[PDB]
Amino acid sequence: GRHMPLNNYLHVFYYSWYGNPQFDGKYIHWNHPVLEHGRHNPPDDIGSSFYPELGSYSSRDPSVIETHMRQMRSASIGVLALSWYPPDVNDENGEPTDNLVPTILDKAHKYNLKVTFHIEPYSNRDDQNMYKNVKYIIDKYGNHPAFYRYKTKTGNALPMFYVYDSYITKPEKWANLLTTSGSRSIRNSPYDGLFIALLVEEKHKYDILQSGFDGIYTYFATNGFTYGSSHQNWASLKLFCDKYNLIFIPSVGPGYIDTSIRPWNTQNTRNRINGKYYEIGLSAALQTRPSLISITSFNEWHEGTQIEKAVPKRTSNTVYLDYRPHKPGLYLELTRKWSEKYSKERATYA
Template sequence: IKQFSTQSIVAFHIQHYKGRTDHSVYNSIKYIIDRYGDHSAFYRFTTSNGKALPLFYIYDSYLTPPEAWAEMLSPTGSHSLRGTLYDSVFIALIVEERHKHDILAGGFDGMYTYFASNGFSYGSLHQNWKGLKAFCDSSNLLFVPSVGPGYVDTSIRPWNNHNTRNRVNGRYYETALQAVLNVRPEIVTVTSFNEWHEGTQIERAVPKKTVTRLYLDYQPYKPNMYLELTRKWAEKFSKEKEEWLM
């Protein structure tokens, strides 16, 4: 969670697509930075050595072998971005425990958990975050836990009811955010702003029903309940982070 003034700041989340390889991602990174790198809304992360670099999240990174990622992300790779104008902070997806070793071998700068359902994967299980943070700290990696207000995707995945997580009037979200504070990460991500099909939206919501769908709302609470909770915890995160660094 990061607070900004009146302008939105954008970091890119690179999804998996048919034919995605380290080479195609390499070309995408170059295009994105060439096209948008000078824009005032282009997010840059200040690293421990003081460099302000673009930050990219690579979804389903485990589908590409670590040896291939290393060709792009290690300094000695055949088409390395390191030390070039396109050098960036690359965050891989941690799903299974074994992926943490692949992430390190692939030359990534960190890992994120993405899934809003506590226990959807090894990486998204809150009780595993302490161990993952320790691994990242010892490996000079960023650990980026992801939180969400709840989860229900049965309208598109009827078989996935076991991963449904009730919002409990905001308590599920706050429990996840407290779990984040307990491991003291540099960054935390929220999944998501408006993915209604997975029930993870935090945007304003009012009652709405169509022929095929009943949309979740936050009644009897205000339409902006989850935006207010996000602001509250962003301020708390910023304050506690200052204390960690003192």
């Protein structure tokens, strides 16, 4: 772009699992029926610490999706990594979110954005059904003009898959799918792609290599929650990734708070302090000179990691956190500033 340049190397983690009565005949993923002790239910008493400018919205409302794409466009975010479960599983307490992918791709395309996939730890996820599911994703969505591909050092452009909780499956199983020799190898097929493992522990570095993964990411917004999410380890991981031609993708967040659904977890709470926590993380990511940067999150409201517009709100039961004294778009604007800084700086790397 020009006065709105889209950073194609900036990815944001995006969730399509919210529902309300209007569009889904019910409230879905806005509170948690884990607190009977209800007079604590939407649209007023959502479980999230912050309150969305769009209300207790529906991910399938196309005006919502539009708005989301406008907001991501204003942050200069080129790519959303969409949370994905397969359409053939038990997991989702609702209608399968794979149903929305085609709309999300269309709306994404209006605004010149791209969609990549963030594969959730669905039930019995293993190498075998991952093969089926990777095929499904590429067959169904791979030719859509908004489908994301990343250009390798070669020039060869590939689909990307962030695999959340990748450590759950053993390296010998990953290797069946992700090494050339593997019995179910996607290598050199039209199903090939760049698979990015979620690194939690230092130990995982070596497992990840062994497995045949093409990159690593860190996910968690709380600096210090894991070895991977701790900024002080990022230089070291970057070094390791460069040594072995892995794509290092640090994940930066604006803060963290989930005490609504986990009252005991105040240790992992990180106050936003008017954007400074965000800027500290962004800064530490840029310092590694990374090939990509990921943002946790566009709209993970339950973990309090969202950059999506939030508004002040008080009810009889709840006073929500908010972005005062700044505007609901504070994090979109901070993201734009740091995106531009990242475009400029990246153009100078090897």
